[PDB]
């Protein structure tokens, strides 16, 4: 009752298909790379993590504080004009 993995032509495109809970994995040796037009995918996907960490730093800087520096200054400009 397991669905067979399938390779088919579909609207002129080469298509690979697996079943309900079956994976499609790309696995190279310890010294191999996965590339899309000479660009290493592992370095692009690692950039997701670097982007995640830099956003954490930026969230802790003057930008990000869930009440902005603009908000606080707005409050005292408010109270002193008042």
């Amino acid at each position: 009752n397991l669905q067979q993995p399938r390779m088919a032509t579909e609207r002129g495109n080469l298509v690979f298909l697996t079943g309900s809970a079956q994976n499609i994995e790309f696995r190279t040796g310890s010294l191999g790379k996965i590339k899309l037009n000479d660009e290493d995918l592992s370095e692009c996907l690692h950039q997701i993590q670097k982007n995640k960490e830099d956003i954490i730093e930026l969230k802790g800087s003057a930008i990000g504080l869930p009440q902005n520096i603009s908000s606080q200054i707005y409050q005292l400009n408010s109270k002193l004009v008042d």
């Binding site: 067979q4 399938r6 390779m7 088919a8 032509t9 495109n13 080469l14």
Partner: protein, 338 residues
């Protein structure tokens, strides 16, 4: 003495597809879902749909490729009933015609029980092709000297059991039979028995499987059934009582080079090996069995060569190491329906 595996699970081999129909450009392909198999691909194939095995692998060698189905040179293959891969469990280790011997020579043949690998044989599965082999039911543990596959040569049971249990081994070896290796050499100049006497019923069942398991009758009265042969044949059998000086390899070359090269012995085939001195069910002794077969419409060439072998023993038996030499022969050739 090397035994080589003949069949394969290659993609680009018409016999491996259901009723010998190889996939055509732009057509559908189906591997049976539950059949575990490793398939070697070496050529390009335009495919509209291909169902892969649930457990298996397509190996993509140099030249292998799978592309989409266009319509130009695809119209032929069209919508014509997908190519299905034949049962990849159909190859039996005990099938004599699935094995090729490295000792094959002109005028030489081997009895059926000695066409499958023997105890002191080196087994080779050619890496140039993917394969799958089954060790049949019962089929007491096959034990050979070594097994070569995937570029490795297994001489220790510990290494072999690791590989056979691994996924690479289970893609290629199946069945309840046990497989083992032992690096011993024969070292007896008079030869060694093949060791397939207990497995002969399974060897003959595999050989006769295309014929419903029944031997076809030989075209002669009083047909002979030599030791290790499944069905009756027409010809002669010479039994030598070997002394401690008998050189089985030299004596076999003597028949092939001295006798078969003679004009009166043209078209004859010989089988020389040490066999048990008995089909006795209980641990019997050994003998040198020479099987002589004449193919074609000839005289008693087999009986004449058999007598020339006894005469050569009566003259040079001491120097050849033969103590005694007997013979038996089949009867008259039948020309009708047996």
């Amino acid at each position: 003495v090397s035994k080589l595996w003949v069949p394969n699970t290659d993609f680009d081999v018409a016999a491996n597809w259901s009723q010998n129909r190889t996939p055509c450009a732009g057509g559908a392909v189906e591997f049976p879902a539950d059949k575990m198999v490793s398939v070697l691909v070496q050529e390009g194939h335009a495919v509209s749909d291909m169902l892969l095995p649930l457990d298996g692998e397509l190996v993509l060698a140099s030249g292998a490729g799978f592309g989409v189905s266009d319509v130009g040179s695809h119209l032929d293959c069209g919508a014509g009933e997908p190519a299905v891969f034949r049962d990849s469990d159909r190859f039996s280790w005990h099938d004599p015609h699935l094995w090729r011997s490295g000792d094959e020579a002109p005028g030489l043949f081997f009895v059926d029980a000695e066409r499958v690998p023997c105890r002191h044989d080196d087994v080779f599965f050619p890496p140039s092709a993917s394969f799958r082999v089954g060790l049949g039911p019962g089929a007491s543990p096959v034990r050979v000297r070594s097994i070569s596959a995937l570029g490795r040569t297994f001489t220790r049971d510990e290494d072999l059991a690791v590989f056979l249990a691994s996924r690479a081994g289970r893609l290629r070896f199946h069945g309840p039979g046990a497989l083992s290796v032992g690096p011993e050499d024969c070292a007896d100049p008079s030869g060694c028995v093949c060791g397939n006497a207990e497995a002969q019923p399974w060897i003959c069942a595999a050989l006769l499987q295309p014929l419903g398991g029944r031997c076809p009758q030989a075209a002669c009265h009083s047909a002979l059934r030599p030791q290790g042969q499944c069905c009756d044949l027409c010809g002669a059998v010479v039994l030598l009582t070997h002394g401690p000086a008998f050189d089985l390899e030299r004596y076999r070359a003597r028949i092939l080079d001295t006798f078969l090269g003679l004009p009166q012995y043209h078209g004859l085939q010989v089988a020389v090996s040490k066999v048990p001195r008995s089909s006795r069910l209980r641990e019997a002794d050994t003998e040198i069995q020479v099987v002589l077969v004449e193919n074609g419409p000839e005289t008693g060439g087999a009986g004449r060569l058999a007598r020339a072998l006894l005469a050569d023993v009566a003259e040079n038996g001491e120097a050849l190491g033969v103590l005694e030499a007997t013979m038996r022969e089949s009867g008259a050739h039948v020309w009708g329906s047996s």
